[PDB]
RNA sequence: GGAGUAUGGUCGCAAGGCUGAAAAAUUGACGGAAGGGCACCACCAGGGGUGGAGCCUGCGCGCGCGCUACACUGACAGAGCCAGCGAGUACUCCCUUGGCCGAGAGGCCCGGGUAAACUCUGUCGUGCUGAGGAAUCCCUAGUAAGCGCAAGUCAUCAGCUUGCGUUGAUUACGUCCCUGCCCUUUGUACACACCGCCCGUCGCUACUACCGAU
């Protein structure tokens, strides 16, 4: 994906998925930016599918 | 009333906490049910075995309450997700 | 060991570069860049922290002698709109009394 | 320490001496008799006198000048003023020893920090 | 968890805070307050009592009685 | 007041760093003392540090008394543990919602010496001020998500440690109609704890079980009507609130009356609620390599 | 070599089934009557949700919880006058018609989808242009409620969480009558002062004698 907005910690990420369904399959997903920050996918965002 | 008082009075009704009787009371009792009573009492006074609405019905309709059990439900499902 | 390795073993990896359809957003931050960011951010937050340390444990009632001789922070209401809680150190000018100004203006 | 270690009265007065001196501030811990032995010191007393502890609370710049202040008398304790510059400030009173009522000093502080109430 | 509770309440133990008395430390036997060699050790003990009494006089009295 | 609490709390910190140095010492001192009774030989450094030997001769009695359990350790709890009754207030978040407010009423009821408080328009620094001017044991928050509570935040006041935990698997008091539930007894409940086997487990049990009143000790194992349980597995401490009647010396029946929680503690700070600049003690470490493999508690 | 510490492997015991799932009690078990203390899960004065319609996280089509709408507390035009929290070299809602300069990868330019509030001045006037039952649940002071502004903190939380400020009432603030819950009827301190042997059904114990088999 690529980040859409960036708050302090929690970042939205947009262009990775085609559906909330695919996301909630990948609930709790072990995600990782290139720079080496680890992280976790937690919920699908609702308004842009 | 309280959980405690209702359980105490129901059990005294059930004779399982009533005072230690005599031989003579034992003879009278042997001279003159409780299983299903206890099971239903248990299921009641541990109400969190299940969900209900607190409200009661949005509309009374007359023609001739547990709302489903989270614990058995999620248990059965996890068995299926296993299998 | 170092003599138990090929030269092509010793060869390097090169880092990838930002997708050319995306150079708009600046460089592609990798681990060098990340740690340099977090170096500076840890440092500046630790300095903020030690500052709030001193402000919380601040005695309400101290008294040095610069207080008779400086110009304080004051507050929002005191200075009004040019208020930043730092305190003013005079650049080095002063009120010239008359005779000096006369001699200067004479030279001018 | 000469008393055998296993005694009640020993235990009671270890605790008593320690916690009492600790509430006199002259220590730093309250669990070590060896610290009482080679630590309890007239120097620590002096650093719990009054002017030294008002330097520590930052009333004034140097403990000399602090002596000069409290000799003029701007420095209150509790509700009294204090002249005797050996008023040994125990630890429950370090939090209280503050400036007096009608003091040019207190008004100077309020001058610098810009709240100078004339009332 | 209901099983564990059952075990403990039958075999009654809880990890509760209790109400420890404020005067265990000074009244280690807890008397009611109303109507009612070893010699060398005893001498040393009353001796330390005397030293302590005198120092505590000096201690309160030095501290100017905030204690 | 305020200069006083600043005074004492920093003195606690500095005395901890003191205890660090001296317990590093007493580690050595321990081995000396054991050798005297044992006659087993010792480390030669221990045999020949002179200030250590003299200092032994002074500071024996602490070691043996701690072996006896004669004293309880220096602690932000040990000052007033079973002496005086801890009063506790429960507050909601800033703008509460109604179901949340009912659930807070429920856990006020579970504690016996509590008050609830409408938070309303109140800066949380001044709520800490209200604390240290009414000498509370404990502040407690609640944060809902949408009608469902999510996090609680125990603080121990005047200055003590704070737990902060998420919640899950919550049930209210108020999903059951009052025809079946009822007013629950405000008797001093017992407490039980299962599976806390770290020193950190004992920290969290300490900050929990010093919430409740002191039981009277004469017949406490015999009396009593109400029992609160804390059990833990996979660092998700689950807590229930039960009430019981003893039908026999061989049989007993329980009734479940409180809300059912699982909370998993994710911030434990020797440091109160306002001080975000305080020393954390254990935080929950996701995002690491084996923060999932290991457990605390 | 000695002393410790670990670590693993070896060895012996534990490792032979009258057996076939579902008490203790001179101290105990259980009441009852009186008397006190308490509580927006009690009384009393009010207030305020949800529950009516739409939206949807959640939980188990049902269900609330939040958001929206619904008119006199109106609409339009002006005039004036007030906050607090926030600073990581860091921040963007699209995605698309064209064209520019780009042998090619792009970059352009043009199109399409430090507050609300409040006060005052003046213009027009109820006009699908309808504030939510029975029930239920909550609330006694900077509280109910209103109003925005920001942040987005290793758990949760953007279909929202959490902060900070702004304006700020009514109504009890007493009483155990209903509902309950707890605690007295033991101890834990003595002067004056006062009170003056609570009650029930059984258990356990010592003794007494009775009855009937062996």
TrEMBL record, chain A:
It is found in: Nucleus, Nucleolus. Belongs to the TRAFAC class translation factor GTPase superfamily. Bms1-like GTPase family. BMS1 subfamily. This is Bms1-type G domain-containing protein. It comes from Chaetomium thermophilum (strain DSM 1495 / CBS 144.50 / IMI 039719).
From TrEMBL, chain B:
Residues 1-83 are annotated as: Disordered. It is found in: Nucleus, Nucleolus. Residues 68-82 have a biased composition (Basic and acidic residues). It comes from the Eukaryota. Belongs to the NOP14 family. Involved in nucleolar processing of pre-18S ribosomal RNA. Has a role in the nuclear export of 40S pre-ribosomal subunit to the cytoplasm. This is Nucleolar complex protein 14. It comes from Chaetomium thermophilum (strain DSM 1495 / CBS 144.50 / IMI 039719) (Thermochaetoides thermophila). The lineage of its organism: Eukaryota, Fungi, Dikarya, Ascomycota, Pezizomycotina. The chain holds residues 3 to 101 of 907 of the full protein.
From TrEMBL, chain D:
Signal peptide: none annotated. One of its GO terms (biological process) is rRNA processing. One of its GO terms (molecular function) is snoRNA binding. Its main location: nucleus. Residues 48-106 form the RNA-binding S4 domain. Keywords: Nucleus, Ribonucleoprotein, Ribosome biogenesis, RNA-binding, rRNA-binding. One of its GO terms (cellular component) is small-subunit processome. It comes from the Eukaryota. It is found in: Nucleus, Nucleolus. Belongs to the universal ribosomal protein uS4 family. This is U3 small nucleolar ribonucleoprotein protein IMP3. The chain holds residues 62 to 180 of 183 of the full protein.
Automatic annotation (TrEMBL), chain E:
It comes from the Eukaryota. It is found in: Nucleus, Nucleolus. Belongs to the MPP10 family. The chain holds residues 541 to 638 of 785 of the full protein. This is Putative U3 small nucleolar ribonucleoprotein protein.
């Amino acid at each position: 994906g690529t980040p859409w907005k960036i708050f302090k910690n929690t970042a939205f990420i947009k262009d990775m998925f085609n559906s909330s369904l695919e996301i909630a399959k990948f609930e709790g997903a072990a995600i990782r930016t290139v720079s080496g920050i680890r992280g976790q996918i937690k919920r699908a965002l609702s308004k842009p599918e | 009333g309280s959980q405690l008082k209702r359980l105490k009075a129901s059990l005294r009704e059930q004779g399982l906490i009533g005072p230690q009787k005599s031989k003579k009371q034992k003879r009278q009792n042997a001279n003159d049910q409780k299983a299903e009573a206890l099971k239903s009492i248990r299921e009641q006074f541990n109400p969190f075995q299940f969900k209900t609405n607190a409200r009661g019905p949005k509309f009374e309709v007359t023609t001739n309450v547990i709302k489903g059990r989270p614990e058995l439900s999620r248990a059965r499902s996890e068995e299926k997700r296993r299998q | 060991m170092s003599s138990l390795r090929h030269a092509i073993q010793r060869r390097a990896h090169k880092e990838r570069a930002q997708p050319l359809e995306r150079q708009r957003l600046g460089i592609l931050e990798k681990k060098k860049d990340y740690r340099l960011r977090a170096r500076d951010y840890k440092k500046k937050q630790a300095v903020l922290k030690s500052l709030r340390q001193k402000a919380a444990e601040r005695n309400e009632d101290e008294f040095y002698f610069g207080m008779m001789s400086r110009k304080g922070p004051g507050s929002a209401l005191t200075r009004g709109k040019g208020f930043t809680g730092t305190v003013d150190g005079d650049r080095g000018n002063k009120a010239l009394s008359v005779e000096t100004v006369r001699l200067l203006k004479t030279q001018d | 320490s000469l008393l055998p270690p296993d005694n009640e009265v020993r235990r009671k007065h270890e605790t008593l001496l320690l916690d009492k001196l600790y509430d006199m501030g002259i220590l730093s811990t309250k669990a070590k008799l060896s610290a009482v032995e080679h630590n309890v010191t007239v120097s620590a007393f002096a650093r719990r006198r009054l002017p030294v502890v008002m330097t520590r609370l930052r009333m004034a710049e140097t403990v000399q000048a602090a002596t000069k202040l409290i000799e003029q008398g701007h420095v209150r304790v509790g509700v009294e003023e204090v002249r005797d510059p050996a008023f040994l400030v125990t630890r429950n009173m370090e939090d209280f020893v503050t400036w007096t009522v009608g003091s040019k000093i207190k008004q100077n502080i309020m001058k610098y920090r810009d709240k100078l109430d004339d009332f | 968890i209901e099983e564990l509770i059952k075990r403990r309440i039958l075999a009654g133990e809880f990890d509760e805070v209790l109400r420890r008395r404020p005067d265990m430390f000074g009244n280690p036997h807890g008397v009611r307050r109303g109507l009612v060699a070893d010699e060398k050790l005893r001498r040393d003990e009353e001796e330390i009592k005397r030293m302590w009494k005198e120092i505590s006089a000096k201690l309160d009295a030095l501290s100017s009685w905030h204690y | 007041m305020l200069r006083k609490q600043a005074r004492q709390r920093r003195d606690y910190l500095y005395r901890r760093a003191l205890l660090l140095r001296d317990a590093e010492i007493a580690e050595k001192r321990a081995k000396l003392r054991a050798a005297l009774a044992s006659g087993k030989p010792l480390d030669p450094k221990i045999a020949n540090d002179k200030e250590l030997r003299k200092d032994f001769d002074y500071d024996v009695s602490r070691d043996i008394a701690k072996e006896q359990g004669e004293i309880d350790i220096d602690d932000e709890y040990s000052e007033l543990s079973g002496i005086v009754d801890p009063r506790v207030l429960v507050t909601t978040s800033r703008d509460p919602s109604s179901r949340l407010m009912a659930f807070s009423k429920e856990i006020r009821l579970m504690f016996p010496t509590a008050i609830r408080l409408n938070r309303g328009n109140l800066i949380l620094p001044d709520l800490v001020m209200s604390a240290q001017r009414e000498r509370l044991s404990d502040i407690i928050l609640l944060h809902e998500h949408r009608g469902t509570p999510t996090a609680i935040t125990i603080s121990h006041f005047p200055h003590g440690p704070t737990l902060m935990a998420s919640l899950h698997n919550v049930v209210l008091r108020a999903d059951i109609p009052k025809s079946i539930k009822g007013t629950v007894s405000e008797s001093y409940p017992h407490l039980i704890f299962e599976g806390f086997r770290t020193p950190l487990g004992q920290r969290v049990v300490k900050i929990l079980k010093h919430l409740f009143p002191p039981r009277d000790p004469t017949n406490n194992a015999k009396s009593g009507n109400r029992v609160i349980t804390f059990v833990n597995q996979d660092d998700c401490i689950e807590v229930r609130h039960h009430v019981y009647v003893r039908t026999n010396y061989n049989s007993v029946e329980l009734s479940e009356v409180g809300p059912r929680f699982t909370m998993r503690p994710f911030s434990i700070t020797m440091g109160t609620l306002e001080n975000k600049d305080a020393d954390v003690e254990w935080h929950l470490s996701q995002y690491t390599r084996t923060g999932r493999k290991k457990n605390y508690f």
